Amino acid sequence: MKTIIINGVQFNTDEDTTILKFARDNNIDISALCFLNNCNNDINKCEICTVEVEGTGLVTACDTLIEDGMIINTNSDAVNEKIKSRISQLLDIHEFKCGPCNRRENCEFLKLVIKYKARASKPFLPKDKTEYVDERSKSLTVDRTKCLLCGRCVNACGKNTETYAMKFLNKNGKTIIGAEDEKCFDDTNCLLCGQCIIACPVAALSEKSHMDRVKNALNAPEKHVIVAMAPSVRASIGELFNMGFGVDVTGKIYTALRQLGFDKIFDINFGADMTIMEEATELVQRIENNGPFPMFTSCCPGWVRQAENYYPELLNNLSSAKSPQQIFGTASKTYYPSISGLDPKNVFTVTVMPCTSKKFEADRPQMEKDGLRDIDAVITTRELAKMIKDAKIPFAKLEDSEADPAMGEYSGAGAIFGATGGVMEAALRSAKDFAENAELEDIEYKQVRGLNGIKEAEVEINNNKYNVAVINGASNLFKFMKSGMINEKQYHFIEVMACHGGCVNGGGQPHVNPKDLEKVDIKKVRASVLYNQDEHLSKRKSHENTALVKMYQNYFGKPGEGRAHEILHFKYKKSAWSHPQ
Template identity: 45%
Template sequence: METVTIKINGVSVSAPKGSTILEAARVAHIDIPTLCFLKEINEIGACRICVVEVKGARSLVASCVYPVNEGMEIWTNTPKVIDSRKKTLQLILSNHNKRCLSCVRSGNCELQSLSKELGVDNESLYSGEMTHSKIDDSAAHMIRDNSKCILCRRCTAVCEQVQSVGVIGANERGFETHIASPFGMGLGETSCVSCGQCIAVCPTGALAEKDAVDEVLAALADPDKHVVVQTAPSVRAALGEGFGLPIGTNVEGKMVSALRRLGFAQVFDTDFAADLTIIEEANELLDRVSKGGTLPLITSCSPGWVKYCEHYFPDMIDNMSTCKSPQQMFGAMLKTYYAEKNHIDPKKIVSVSVMPCTAKKFEIGRDHQSAAGVPDVDIAMTTRELVRMVERTGINFLELPDEEFDNPLGESTGASVIFGVSGGVMEAALRTAVWKLTGENPDSPIEFTEVRGMQGIKEASYDVAGLTVNVAVASGLKNAHDLLTKIKNGEANYQFVEIMGCPGGCINGGGQPIVDSKTRNFVDYRALRAKALYDEDASKDLRKSHDNPNIKKLYEEYLGTPGGHKAHETLHTKYVKRKIQ
């Protein structure tokens, strides 16, 4: 690697050629504050918080986009620099709703941290007129409060460039500038796919999921309700971050423990339904291959991706698996199988889910998601909401003992755990498809490492029992867009495709604990969370969905055969064509 030698604050530093001052400073153990900058997503040098002095430059420069050159001399913390940052921050704060006390982001707000670091706290400086704004709560999954927006454009960049959606942008100009959808449409009227990536990158409390904490607490306090919870695989890989644990800590045991203490009648695992999804989806794949059905079959676990397909590739909705997502399959089994077995009226069951995802809040309200005549899932919460709920109820999460899920809907295999990572559903399905095609069930090999990793698009080809299976995996909707375009143009021939709405899969879902930009820009937090799930998979005795004894029992006692009549009634769904707007 070619390097250049520069001086930062008088200290000689060797930095990779082409790196920015921000990156080079990091090598020298100096953090330069940033606000609008998100590596590879929003590199616009607009907010001016990251300014530094460069010898010979006429004015302060934005270190996030300014490349280093041989012999460059940089000062990152002179009075001139700090004064400039303070002024910038004061101007931002002058148009910011500073009701921080119970703001959803209080404690992990980047604006708040900066104010503290720079010692900017004079309220009287900021008492002028503010841009008028209205709260947009038209979408099922989130709220936009522009009074807290600092116009950094991180949300619009992620929406357009990473997700290929682009339903929000900067409208009007000057003092009237605001981030919104065109023609005054509420987000809920647009072709927003509910992925929540905008929330995940927002530095302040301008964007947040619709909070269901109080609703769940009220249900738990109602003696007439039977409140049951399920948790998605990737929640356990990130929940700990909300309590200060390092990224990638698997807190499954403490999570179960906390949910039990919150008063849920049963604490179940969405992984059980992920195993069920694999049985149904592998069956559907082999059925389509043998009967000449629509191929490639594309997974339907990610509701952000499903909605994207409906809006942006409506002519490909027949490619999507008719399988409900694991969340919905779980809810369906809870309100039919579990309710019948335990003689509970499904109307008295409150089916709660904890998900890494904001699109799950949209999914629970979709049509054809009510196996028992009532919604399969009543309340979908994000990982972040669970953190809040635990905090509000005074449960000391870090000191909890590890506990295990309840059964029968808590049993799961390693295959289902990796659902939370891009490539995981593919790998889990392949493990079962190989067994179905060959009739053999060896202990190994069961790992399909070609579909692992954080690349946006992954391809592989496998020979199974004389059949060549071409597969592709995409995560992040821009990647999905590119892959689907290739398929549509006949440039690729796959039998099975996995698509996840969020880059890296559910571990990086829009409902996961916020990772601040300082960490995002320098740490591969997605890979760390993914590792927690792959480690759990490797440590499990059962690693293939079809080996889950409770799944076998479910088919024997209730569902009959995979893809059979009962399974179709309860576990499959329909899609609709939607417009772009």
């Protein structure tokens, strides 16, 4: 073993680990900032994790290995003055104005400033933020007056996506982060997944705000504002109201949305059942036409951008079913007026998403018909939370209410969409019933669930074997393709999610501080809310959703043909030949 003394306390251990990790395991307090995802900022270490090792001096705990004979002090005056000094140097490049800041309630940097009682040498007070701010993107925004150059976003993009779309850049002799050549992110290979935002300790990276879109529509007397939340929102937003992790707050959200003034409370899980109707029908059509195989899901816009940017030859293989968001939106401007009497032009449809990429999807030029956008606004889980708090709605004390049913009912199949493997599982439940013209009892496909990066299964559909895969994270899509796995067998149906864990880990979700991430498996705990709902629901197949069945019967007809095909689908095409390209 080794013997280690920390702040006068002897430890016997044979672990090979860092001082930071050993301390955290033994409830010894050490601060950290740039350390995340088992990486610190290798080209500009923050040194907030400074501790003192007798005989060696000041060291960074986050990457210094424990060794036999080490005597460590984490709280000497020399340590604290060094840490304090580093925080003071960061304050010198930080617009320290927490009042209006969208990370005020959970900012890692503020907590460190308070802890060490640090102060700027010179308060950073730029008079014109224009040059520091980039709001060109439909999905992301950068405010470099808040940027600590901690590198967490650069490392998170690399690890989560392997695009390296987020880079260190040299701008006029100064270091910044940004997209390739300081372009708009949208105009680069970036997936707009927002994992970089999720990694950021401060408010430097954010979602493109849609909050004014929403407030102006609510305030317009002639606008009728529909709101519909994603699967993942009901399993996560509670975290921002100090309710802890893994709490189902579906009913509270419906009540809060009514208190915010929305005119109709629907649910994107209804749209998820629509997507399955169309997609499971398409799978059965492809089986009968013998392809094109594999069919890929098309509901994740981060993956769609990944395909567009890296694998355009797969675009024809994507399912033509719109995503639950866009397929919902389409019906909100067509079906919903037909059962309400509203003028379609006066319907304003808002979604609440765990996702930044969804904002780009919604603003795609052709995502409209007859001049009416499918989706007029997308707010993130975080934006809704702020909307609720701004309205002084006592979220944690609200009673449960229900959604308006016509486009609000959902099956258990729709409910699990937010977890990796959920779309696959939901699609199979319907494709099997469709192909075998039957009502099977065994509907649980636990083989495609969980956090493994690449998940294969063999499935039997109408007395033949088919090969499916669930790709869990954009980096795993690249692994799957580059390694040749795609070619090792004939795949027939593949789910791809850009965010590892599925949408429950999307770029629009509540931030979680590094400490809690050590203690909580956020991906499993959020997904557990969804699978729980599926278990306790009467209808667990999309085509059994009674409100959906009514809609198709009275308005669309049969899925995958006629009107349904005409307006609930959307195809992506690779660019035509040109030269130069």
